Design a binder for this molecule. Structure first.
Ligand SMILES: NC(=S)c1ccc[n+]([C@@H]2O[C@H](COP(=O)([O-])OP(=O)(O)OC[C@H]3O[C@@H](n4cnc5c(N)ncnc54)[C@H](OP(=O)(O)O)[C@@H]3O)[C@@H](O)[C@H]2O)c1
Ligand SMILES: C[C@H](O)[C@H](O)C1=Nc2c(nc(N)[nH]c2=O)NC1
Ligand SMILES: [Ca+2]
Length: 186
């Protein structure tokens, strides 16, 4: 595939989850951002693909599965078949990448988004391919049991601006956050 996109929300301690959920209570606007970025294809007749770990998949309320308007691919070394509602199951990122290139998919897919968790982000980060990381930095700390892997600031250059991404510090529910885009060129 040409390039990857990863999206995540992190707090000050780099936590991304706690007890099978997000460490903070609901933020409406941040959520809509994720929906908008992951769902928006720039080609008619094509849809985006989202890739995610098993834990992540099960974290989404069942009635909300699969994420509407995207091809959901779950990764698992243990499952035998895609969980009820997922489009495809893959045993590794590589496998997932190959499937995407498959003829049946290739023409059906616009963008590939990596939606975590940890191991998923890590794996994608290490692929020597063009990659854009969309980070929402929540400017507070919350107790977390799961964390975002360390990004190589030598590879991933923070962009100072990106089309459609608000620049300023945002606030909602008394919480401040900022959007940042990092880009790796291969
Ligand atoms: N802040 C944001 S935006 C965000 C985004 C995603 C998740 N979360 C949170 O983080 C937690 C879920 O994340 P996590 O890191 O614990 O779990 P996940 O990555 O979602 O799930 C882990 C499992 O997925 C499979 N897997 C993961 N990476 C794999 C790979 N490269 N190849 C094959 N299978 C792989 C394995 O399943 P098997 O054991 O079956 O092999 C592994 O046990 C929840 O609290 C969720 O809310 C937060
Ligand atoms: C995909 C699943 O809902 C998951 O927890 C994710 N949540 C978010 C995300 N990305 C952002 N920006 N915000 C979220 O709430 N990526 C993944
Ligand atoms: Ca396991």
């Amino acid at each position: 595939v040409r390039s990857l996109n990863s999206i995540v929300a992190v707090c000050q301690n780099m936590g991304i989850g706690k007890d099978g959920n997000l460490p903070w209570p609901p933020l409406r606007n941040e959520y809509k951002y994720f929906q908008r970025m992951t769902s928006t294809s720039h080609v008619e007749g094509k849809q985006n693909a989202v890739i995610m770990g098993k834990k992540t998949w099960f974290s989404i309320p069942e009635k909300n599965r699969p994420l509407k308007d995207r091809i959901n691919i779950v990764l698992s070394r243990e499952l035998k078949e895609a969980p009820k509602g997922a489009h495809y199951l893959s045993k590794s990122l590589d496998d997932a990448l190959a499937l995407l290139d498959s003829p049946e998919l290739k023409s059906k897919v616009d963008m590939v988004w990596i939606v975590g968790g940890t191991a998923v982000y890590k794996a994608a980060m290490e692929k020597p391919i063009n990659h854009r990381l969309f980070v929402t930095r929540i400017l507070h700390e919350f107790e977390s049991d799961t964390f975002f892997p360390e990004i190589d600031y030598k590879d991933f250059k923070l962009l100072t601006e990106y089309p459609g991404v608000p620049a300023d510090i945002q606030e909602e529910d008394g919480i401040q956050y900022k959007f940042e885009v990092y880009q790796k060129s291969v």
